[PDB]
């Protein structure tokens with residue numbers, strides 16, 4: 331299925347390559363100017379919106395999630411690209427206008443592929459199937475990461491479905507953060 | 511199908527985002543120290559090996575394809591990653607130990623997802639199906655790029671299937687280059 335392949339692609343072509351090196355990058359940042367602040371958490375927080383809406387700025391999604399810093403970028407030779415670069419961004423989570431947590435955080439971009447395929451008629455992908463494909467993407471990624479030696483206790487899947495309109499993305503992440 | 515999704519992912523999540531900006535990056539490089547050399551071609555050359563073997567160094571694949579330079583990297587905010595970086599590499603193609611062409615060149619990494627899925631039993635993907643999925647990936651990508659407004663005359667798909675062992679990847683690319 332589409333989402334089956336997208337989840338394997340997300341692991342094979344991305345997470346398997348950055349997760350083995352994430353813990354060291356995070357420690358280098360925490361050991362850096364950051365002297366008086368709380369340490370960045372050790373896991374990649376991956377936002378999995380089941381509506382497949384992947385905006386490019388998280389502060390648009392919630393002004394309680396504000397960008398703090400970029401992690402030291404990782405480079406590797408990949409598929410003929412010398413020094414292919416992996417950047418990741420650090421966000422602070424605000425709770426009543428005070429810092430309640432700090433983590434590397436991003437959206438699972440393959441969900442945007444499902445969104446776009448549902449928009450383009452040439453994809454032969456129905457809007458009405460997108461929700462179940464997004465759930466299947468998340469379930470498959472969970473299945474993979476449970477057994478994968480790279481992704482062992484250094485990412486956190488945050489899946490959610492917005493209503494009512496009363497939704498706090500920051501509270502979703504904070505729920506997962508403080509359970510460690 | 512798996513490869514259907516992978517081809518839409520490759521376009522939506524990558525090619526649609528770098529191709530609109532490639533021509534300007536290539537011109538900036540050609541207008542740069544490069545004063546006496548031939549200009550880099552205007553298209554992204556995408557290697558599509560139907561055996562799904564995506565090595566990380568092209569000089570391993572053929573010593574007649576040798577790395578020349580990195581293009582000026584492109585950055586954009588993406589899915590919560592500030593200044594997500596797209597690097598691409600420039601290769602020269604040798605013919606009888608003289609430069610016969612110069613182009614931006616890389617492998618279509620989603621083919622490596624098919625390769626890996628055929629290797630991992632949890633993917634439920636048979637080795638015997640990989641060849642037809644790789645062909646379907648290429649066919650779908652061609653179908654997409656024909657209609658896509660981004661990818662109009664700025665990439666070149668190089669699909670091939672090695673035997674005999676007598677195969678020249680450099681000659682494949684040079685065939686496509688000199689037809690412009």
Ligand SMILES: Cc1sc2ncn3c(SCC(=O)O)nnc3c2c1C
Pocket residue numbers: 339340342343344438439440523588589591594619620
């Ligand atoms: C084969 C695949 S899936 C996938 N998903 C997210 N990726 C990222 S983060 C933000 C982005 O998509 O640009 N960087 N590479 C990937 C990537 C790759 C390279």
Ligand SMILES: Cc1sc2ncn3c(SCC(=O)O)nnc3c2c1C
Pocket residue numbers: 343408409411414439440519520522523524618619620
């Ligand atoms: C969603 C997808 S597919 C895909 N295919 C190749 N991509 C590249 S080149 C080399 C690489 O894979 O790392 N950079 N991003 C991608 C990419 C992304 C971000």
